[model samples]
Target: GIYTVKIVLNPKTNKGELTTEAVDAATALKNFGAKAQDVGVDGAWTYSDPTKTFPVGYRLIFKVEMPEDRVNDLARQLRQRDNVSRVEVTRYK
Candidate 1:
């Protein structure tokens, strides 16, 4: 079975355009063979706060498809990265 992951970025860490964090996050997942398939933004990012985290908060959601067994390790690796706020895993039979 394949798996789906909903990853939210830490408001305290992910701010501004979110491009940097998104690219890095996607790379991390793809490198692990997780195959980051899509990206969704929950809120708009402004250039007003480039050096600090956005207070209102934002979400960087990535949906990926990966092998079921391998998901265990993939999830672990993702959780270890301090950039992410939440890592929710869903699967299908």
Candidate 2:
């Protein structure tokens, strides 16, 4: 009854400043009944401009074990976060 979930974060989401916040969010999900199997933040590349460099937002991929009925609800919760841009859920065979 478990599935995999992928979370895409907004470009403006800060990794350094928001690290603790992210952890808290994950803890919230656990409290809500999802068990995190794996979590990772994808790396971002810097775009160079004439005056400065800008970083692009990356994805936060999470593989979780939870009841099928609760996957979409969790995805919805994650999408409500200011830092999260999108959420995707798929069952892994």
Candidate 3:
């Protein structure tokens, strides 16, 4: 069960950069059940530093092994964050 996740902080009134210490969506995923076994950087996520200024807050396309329902549940929680900016949950194999 590998899943992908992404988050952006540019739209928020807070820091335009990405940091997992703010208790935001990124933090949620980090502390999410099972956690991420592997964090793979891809596309913009790799080009931009998780801390540098880049219109991107975070991306975990993070390789992980988690139960579907738990990921679904986490997705549900992240869905509510569209209010902050944009969050994504992608299909896994």
Candidate 4:
């Protein structure tokens, strides 16, 4: 059983960054039985104000017990969607 998982994505440097796609993906993942434990978009702050700007990209972490056989399947499905950078899974050993 996996308790905690973390997903990270590269920062978006484009002019117009659309986050709706990511938000929809996260919601869809939850509907697919994935427990969204936490989400993080940016790292620590720089010398300037941390909350001044929004994070470039998005990342989602969850706890799940999905079968090993379906692991890659779900990952691939998520990757195919727009704004989805990547998906990774880890289990508690």
lDDT of each: 0.50, 0.54, 0.44, 0.43
Score candidate 2 by TM-score against the native: 0.60
Q: Which lDDT tens digits does candidate 1 get at residues 1-93?
A: 445544456666644546665555355556654442332321112122223354555555444455556555555555556776655567743
Candidates arranged by TM-score, highest first? 2, 1, 3, 4
TM-score, cand. 3: 0.44
Backbone clashes for every candidate come to: 0, 0, 0, 0
**Candidate 3 per-residue C-alpha lDDT over 1-93 given as tens digits, one digit per residue, 9 for 90 to 100:** 566555443444344233331234345556663333444321112122255345434432233345555556555555555443545566666
State in Å the error of residue 65, model 1.
2.7
| Candidates 1 and 4 compared by TM-score, better number | 1
Q: What TM-score would each prediction reach against the true structure?
A: 0.48, 0.60, 0.44, 0.44
CA displacement after TM-score superposition, residue 36 of candidate 3 (Å): 8.6
CA RMSD (A), model 2: 8.3
lDDT of 2 at 66: 59
Ordered from best to worst lDDT, the candidate numbers read: 2, 1, 3, 4
* Tens digits of lDDT, candidate 2, 1-71: 44666666677766563444345336646666434343322111112123212347656545555565666
Model 2 pairs in collision: none
Candidate 2, residue 8: CA error in Å?
Answer: 1.0
Best by TM-score: 2
